[PDB]
Design a protein around this nucleic acid. Structure first.
Lengths: 277, 50
RNA sequence: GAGU
DNA sequence: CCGCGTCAGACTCGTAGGATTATAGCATACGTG
DNA sequence: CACGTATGCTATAATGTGTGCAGTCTGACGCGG
C-alpha cells in the first residue's frame, strides 16, 4: 500500500479540524487549567501550521521529517505558554516558537562536531557581513577585510572560519572513480613500524646488559629507583627503607652508577652514540 | 619509557620543544632548484627570503 | 591513462 | 504462468585533490579557578 | 565574579510535502497472487 513515512504522517494530520479564534480561546482557557483533551486538540489542529513552517526552514538543514518533529516540540512549548486572554492570535505566537525550536535544533544537530550556540551565532554574523562586503567589493572578502569591517581581531575571524571547515567522509572514494577511499591511503601515524617496535626491544635489552655490568648495589638501586626491573618507581625513601636506611646513600649509589655507565660508554659507547639519530 | 628516563638522566640531553617537519627531496628524485615561491598571510611577519 |  | 525483485558482473598498475548552506538577538542559568 | 556553555522567550495573521534527481542494462532465480 502507501509506505512513505511522510505521506502517512501528513494524511493523519489532515484529519483534524481547524480552529476559529473563539474556539481557540475557549479550548485554551481549559488547556491552561489542564484539560488534557483541550491541549491535545489544539496541538493536533495546529500541526498543519508546523508542517507549513518546516517546509520553509528545511532546504538543507535536515530531513523534512526531522524538522517537523523539532517544530512540533516548539508548538508544544507554545501551547504551554499561550495567553488566551491576550487578543493576539495563536498561530502568530506559535510561529515564533516553532521557528525558534527548529533553528536551535539545526544549530546543534547539523554539525558533526557539536558547536556551541555562541560560536555558531558569532560565525553567522561573520558570514552575513562577508555577504554584504562581497556584494560591494565585487570580490569575496578576505579574513582581514571582514575583520576590518567589524573592527575586531583577525585571529578571531580566522579561528571562526577554521571551525566552519566542513567534514569529509573517510569512506568517500577519490577521483570521480569508485576505486578507493581516503581510508585506503590514511596511515596510522601513532603505530610505528616493526622497525620501531624491534628497536625498542633492542634498546631495552641493551640496557639490561649494561645494568648487569655494574655493581650489584648500583644496579639494584638504579633498577628500583627508575622502576626499570622493579614494579614501581620507588622514591629515595622507599629504596633506602628496603635496603640501607640512608636515603642520602641511595642518591650517592645512583649517581655513582650513572658515572660508571658513562665510562662504559666512552669505552664501548661506539654503539651507544649511534642511538642518536 | 624508564629506559629513556635513565638515559636522558645519564646524557642530560633533555629533548627540546620543537620537532621537525621539514620538506625534503623525495627519494631518488634529484635535480636543480630553479624557482621558489613564497606565500604569507596578510599580517604575519615575512621571511627574509620572501 | 598502463599490460592483460 | 506473470511480474516484480535481488543478485551477481577478472587481476594488477596509475593521476589528482575537492564542494555547499546557515541558523535572530538578548536575558538568565550552570559549572570551574 | 567571571568565562564558557545553555536554556529561553518573543503575541497582526500565517494551518497536508513536492523539487531534484533517475535514468531506463542483463541474464537468472524465486516469490505472492
Amino acid at each position: 500500500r502507501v509506505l512513505d513515512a511522510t505521506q502517512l504522517y501528513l494524511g493523519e494530520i489532515g484529519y483534524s479540524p481547524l480552529l476559529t479564534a473563539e474556539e481557540e480561546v475557549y479550548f485554551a482557557r481549559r488547556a491552561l487549567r489542564g484539560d488534557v483533551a483541550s491541549r491535545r486538540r489544539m496541538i493536533e489542529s495546529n500541526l498543519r501550521l508546523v508542517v507549513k513552517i518546516a517546509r520553509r526552514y528545511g532546504n538543507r538543514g535536515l530531513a523534512l521529517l526531522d524538522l517537523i518533529e523539532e517544530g512540533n516540540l516548539g508548538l508544544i512549548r507554545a501551547v504551554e505558554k499561550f495567553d488566551p486572554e491576550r487578543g493576539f492570535r495563536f498561530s502568530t505566537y506559535a510561529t515564533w516558537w516553532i521557528r525558534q525550536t527548529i533553528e536551535r535544533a539545526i544549530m546543534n544537530q547539523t554539525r558533526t562536531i557539536r558547536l556551541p550556540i555562541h560560536i555558531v551565532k558569532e560565525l553567522n554574523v561573520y558570514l552575513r557581513t562577508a555577504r554584504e562586503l562581497s556584494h560591494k567589493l565585487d570580490h569575496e572578502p578576505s579574513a582581514e577585510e571582514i575583520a576590518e569591517q567589524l573592527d575586531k581581531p583577525v585571529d578571531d575571524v580566522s579561528r571562526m572560519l577554521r571551525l566552519n571547515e566542513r567534514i569529509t567522509s573517510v569512506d568517500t572514494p577519490l577521483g570521480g572513480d569508485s576505486e578507493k577511499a581516503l581510508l585506503d591511503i590514511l596511515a596510522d601515524e601513532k603505530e610505528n613500524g616493526p622497525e620501531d617496535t624491534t628497536q625498542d626491544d633492542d634498546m631495552k635489552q641493551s640496557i639490561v646488559k649494561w645494568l648487569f655490568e655494574l655493581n650489584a648495589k648500583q644496579r639494584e638501586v638504579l633498577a628500583r629507583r627508575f622502576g626499570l626491573l622493579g614494579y614501581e618507581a620507588a622514591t629515595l625513601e622507599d629504596v633506602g627503607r628496603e635496603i640501607g636506611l640512608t636515603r642520602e646513600r641511595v642518591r650517592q649509589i645512583q649517581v655513582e652508577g650513572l658515572r660508571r655507565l658513562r665510562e662504559i660508554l666512552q669505552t664501548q659507547g661506539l654503539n651507544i652514540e649511534a642511538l642518536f639519530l | 619509557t624508564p629506559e629513556e628516563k635513565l638515559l636522558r638522566a645519564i646524557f642530560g640531553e633533555k629533548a627540546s620543544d620543537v620537532k621537525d617537519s621539514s620538506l625534503r627531496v623525495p627519494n631518488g628524485v634529484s635535480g636543480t632548484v630553479i624557482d621558489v615561491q613564497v606565500f604569507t598571510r596578510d599580517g604575519v611577519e615575512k621571511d627574509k627570503r620572501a
